[PDB]
Design a protein around this ligand. Structure first.
Ligand code: ANZ
Ligand SMILES: [C][C]([C])[C][C]([N])C(=O)O=[S@]([N])(=O)O[C][C]1O[C](N2[C]=NC3=C([N])N=[C]N=C32)[C]([O])[C]1[O]
Ligand code: ZN
Ligand code: ZN
Length: 810
């Protein structure tokens, strides 16, 4: 008897499914929008990417079989840093690089039997897409959500551009993990995402997303209970407002500090102090914010010779000015609480100011004297009637009391900052603004979009050196002012890649509209995304930014939903066994040579055998005569451990790779790509083929029609097992439990073998085989389709999903 042979059959079915257009989505649709995170065309796709993309294909096929109108699209996140950094690293022009990579990625997807509605392809670096970036940008400008501001920004010296706060990961560039970001002062474009902070927080509650992602976004947004508190100045009319995120500490405010630039600094200075204060104010203004944000620097300040009354204690406190208080934040004035704020602690110690404890540490009380500030939550003490209150609650109680007594007011604030979107890079969407010497910043009219990127041909011209490459090109930026008609300069910064990806899932609903980003009728018919699949690395990047874009476009009236992704599933990383290099072992201790340690990215030069085990590593004898330390590491280019699709499917096959992926572990978990997994996939597919091949002749002479209620013995038993299997596989598919679905098919395959020991090929067996192939199709579609055609005329796409007999489960 012949054996399963994936060669030839896969190419045959791949072409068939595409020709037939089974995965073409209707312009207006039950619907299911199954979305996977579209890739940066920055390199070869490997099995890691293909775990994400096979997962979407499984669900898309399953839903399509059930009768849903299914939208399952693909496209290219082709602008900004990832495409351009990759092209530039290999001295290639971005456009050439991007389209070569797209061609390769398409083939990788096709060869795995993944099916998209390719009629909905988007390529974000094309003006047919980026013109709509520009349109959205103009609407944001119009609605008070896009602005230019001077201030401190994060700078990647390798990218040679500013980055958004979200693109800084443990102090490093999201793209250059070895490179600490630096601070610069620059005038840049921002999207006012903080205008949506409360909605972004509150609207997480209804969401079928992993709790870890919700927690990351909650922490990132970082809502806090704050207050403005008024301090009356002794002998004066003015009451100084201070902004505080610790209103619970008010009874411990022992002095006030005003920014040097605060109008009251010179206004309140005693006559004899004025000279000294003015000199200090002038010295401060000679510094940069960075310089005033510097630490380890001398603590400086001047006492103004003025006092304020603490509104809680009714006690007189001195008013100082000091460099460390910045004029542009809060009210430009602070209450200093040396017992609980370390900056104030060090200042008070230097200048001999009182330190007063008002938050007690739970467990062991704070010592006397206090040697450093106590900055964590505790129990209010020396705080009059608030004594004993847990301090976070006490914030709310002090705010209520302030408001009641006319002494201040609650002010809610957020850790979240506005989104720095402009980039000093060529390969990105031009910002649709003009700078006129007379009018200021003026928008490009909607009717002139796109503002086309100029076609720079020389890679060395494009290479970013600190300024936008477009600054070298007056043929692009020299223009006329739309407002007054005089000479003006186009903005020369471009939009970050995350602009593009914040609405692509809407473009897929209307991919060729040349009058709007999309028609709301079409978007609203397909939205929200029923199931989104992609990596947790986007938790506060794309998965936050997209929610902002959707709420904005909703507020413009263009989108009915306020949440773009109703379900989000974060897939764990595919890892590969990776050689980190030689080690030496003596007893229980493994010595790591420097190059081995550095590749592992760990501080230890010595690990115990137990440490090696616990990190998932092992020691393997090498030909070089040493033991090498091997460990699973995330599949990626940087580790040189990618399993690429072309070579693998040529040597083995697509269904083999699909089963390897899908069976390895729960999809939310990490998995290791292994030879054992590949062999297990072969064993299963071979066993399916063998069972059906063994019975092919008998199956051809058997009808599938029977009456379930007349079955007896093993026939009745098989019918029950069949429906148990169907229930389990269907529910697992709905839940993305893909590995246990496959386990259920493996177990039912065993049942089919066991059945055939006692029973011949019967009508019920034929129906079981039919149903088996239908249930197999989302997972191993090529084999399923191959065997289906041995007995039945049309595609598995046309066969439907089998109907569950609930009575069979009793
Ligand atoms: N213009 C300014 N320059 C320098 N520092 C300023 C400031 N305005 C306020 N602050 C300080 O930073 C906290 C958060 O404010 P932002 O959210 O950063 O603006 C505020 O709450 B806090 O007030 C009392 C207190 C007690 C404590 F145990 C810890 C902290 C504070 O000090 C204020
Ligand atoms: C933002 C947007 C939505 C997205 C972007 N574009 C991204 O991210 O792209 S990339 N990077 O290309 O990616 C895509 C996807 O895929 C995945 N992955 C990768 N790698 C891997 C492994 N190794 N495993 C698993 N998975 C994976 C990611 O995550 C995403 O989702
Ligand atoms: Zn960088
Ligand atoms: Zn003008």
């Amino acid at each position: 008897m012949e054996k399963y042979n994936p060669h030839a059959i896969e190419a045959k079915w791949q072409r068939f499914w595409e020709e037939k257009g089974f995965m073409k989505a209707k312009d207006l649709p039950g619907k299911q929008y199954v979305l996977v995170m579209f890739p940066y065309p920055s390199g070869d796709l490997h099995m890691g990417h293909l775990k994400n993309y096979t997962m979407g294909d499984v669900l898309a096929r399953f839903r399509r079989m059930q009768g849903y109108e299914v939208l399952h699209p693909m496209g290219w996140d082709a602008f900004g840093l990832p495409a351009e950094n990759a092209a530039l690293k290999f001295g290639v022009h971005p456009k050439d690089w991007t389209y070569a990579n797209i061609r390769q990625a398409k083939e990788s997807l096709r060869l795995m039997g993944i099916l998209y509605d390719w009629d909905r392809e988007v390529t974000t670096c094309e003006p047919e897409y980026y013109r709509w970036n520009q349109w959205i940008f103009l609407k944001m400008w119009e609605k008070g959500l896009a602005y230019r501001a001077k201030g401190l920004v994060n700078w990647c010296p390798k990218c040679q551009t500013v980055l958004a706060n979200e693109q800084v990961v443990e102090g490093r560039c999201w793209r250059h993990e070895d490179t600490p970001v630096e601070k610069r002062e620059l005038e840049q474009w921002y999207l006012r995402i903080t205008a949506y902070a409360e909605r972004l927080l509150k609207d997480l509650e209804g969401l079928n997303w992993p709790e870890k992602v919700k927690a990351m976004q909650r922490a990132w947004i970082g809502r806090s209970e704050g207050a403005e508190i008024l301090f009356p100045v002794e002998g004066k009319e003015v009451r100084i407002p201070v902004f505080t995120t610790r209103p619970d500490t008010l009874f411990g405010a022992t002095f006030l500090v005003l920014a040097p630039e605060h109008p009251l600094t010179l206004e309140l200075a005693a006559p004899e102090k004025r000279e000294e204060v003015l000199a200090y104010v002038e010295a401060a203004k000679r510094k940069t914010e960075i310089e005033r944000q510097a630490e380890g620097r001398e603590k400086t300040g001047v006492f103004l010779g003025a006092y304020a009354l603490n509104p809680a204690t009714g006690e007189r406190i001195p008013i100082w000015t000091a460099d460390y208080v910045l004029f542009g934040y809060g009210t430009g004035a602070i209450m200093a609480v040396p017992a609980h704020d370390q900056r104030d602690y060090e200042f008070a110690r230097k200048f001999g100011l009182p330190i007063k404890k008002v938050i007690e540490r739970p467990g062991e009380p704070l010592p006397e004297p206090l040697e450093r500030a106590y900055e964590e939550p505790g129990i209010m003490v020396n705080s009059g009637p608030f004594d004993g209150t847990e301090s976070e609650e006490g914030k709310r109680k002090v705010i209520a009391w302030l408001e009641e007594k006319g002494l201040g007011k609650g002010r809610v604030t957020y850790r979240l900052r506005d989104w720095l979107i402009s980039r000093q890079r060529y390969w990105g969407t031009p910002i649709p603004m003009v700078h006129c010497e007379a009018c200021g910043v003026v928008p490009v009219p909607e009717e002139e979009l796109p503002v086309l990127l100029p076609d720079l041909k020389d890679v060395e011209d494009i290479r970013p050196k600190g300024k936008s490459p477009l600054e070298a090109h007056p043929e692009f930026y020299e223009t006329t002012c739309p407002k007054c008609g005089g000479p003006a300069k186009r903005d020369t910064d471009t939009m970050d890649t995350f602009f593009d990806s914040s609405w692509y899932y809407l473009r897929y609903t209307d991919p060729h509209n040349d009058r709007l980003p999309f028609d709301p009728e079409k978007a609203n018919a397909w939205m929200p995304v029923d199931q989104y699949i992609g990596g947790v690395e986007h938790a506060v990047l794309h998965l936050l930014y997209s929610r902002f874009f959707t709420k904005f476009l909703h507020d413009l009236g263009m989108v009915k939903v306020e949440e773009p992704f109703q379900g989000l599933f974060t897939q764990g990383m595919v890892l590969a066994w990776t050689d980190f290099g030689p080690v030496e072992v003596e007893g229980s201790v493994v010595r790591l040579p420097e190059p081995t340690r550095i590749r592992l990215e760990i501080p230890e030069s010595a690990l115990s055998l137990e440490d090696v085990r616990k990190m998932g590593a092992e020691l393997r004898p090498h030909e070089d005569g040493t033991l090498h330390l091997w460990k699973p590491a995330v599949m990626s280019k940087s580790k040189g451990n990618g399993v690429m699709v072309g070579p693998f499917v040529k040597e083995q096959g697509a269904d083999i790779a699909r089963i390897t992926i899908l069976f390895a572990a729960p999809p939310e978990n990490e998995m290791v790509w292994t030879e054992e997994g590949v062999q297990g996939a072969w064993r299963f597919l071979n066993r399916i083929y063998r069972r059906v091949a063994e019975d092919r002749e008998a199956l051809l002479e058997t009808s599938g029609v029977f009456q379930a209620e007349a079955l007896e013995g093993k026939d009745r038993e098989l019918y029950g097992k069949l429906h148990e299997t169907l229930k389990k596989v269907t529910e697992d598919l709905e839940a993305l439990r893909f590995n246990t679905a496959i386990a259920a098919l493996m177990e039912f395959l065993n049942a089919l073998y066991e059945y055939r020991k006692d029973r011949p090929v019967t009508p019920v067996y034929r129906t079981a085989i039919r149903y088996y192939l239908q249930m197999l199709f989302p997972f191993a579609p090529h084999l399923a389709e191959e065997l289906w055609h041995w007995f039945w005329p049309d595609s598995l796409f046309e066969a439907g999903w089998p109907e569950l007999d609930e009575k069979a489960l009793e």
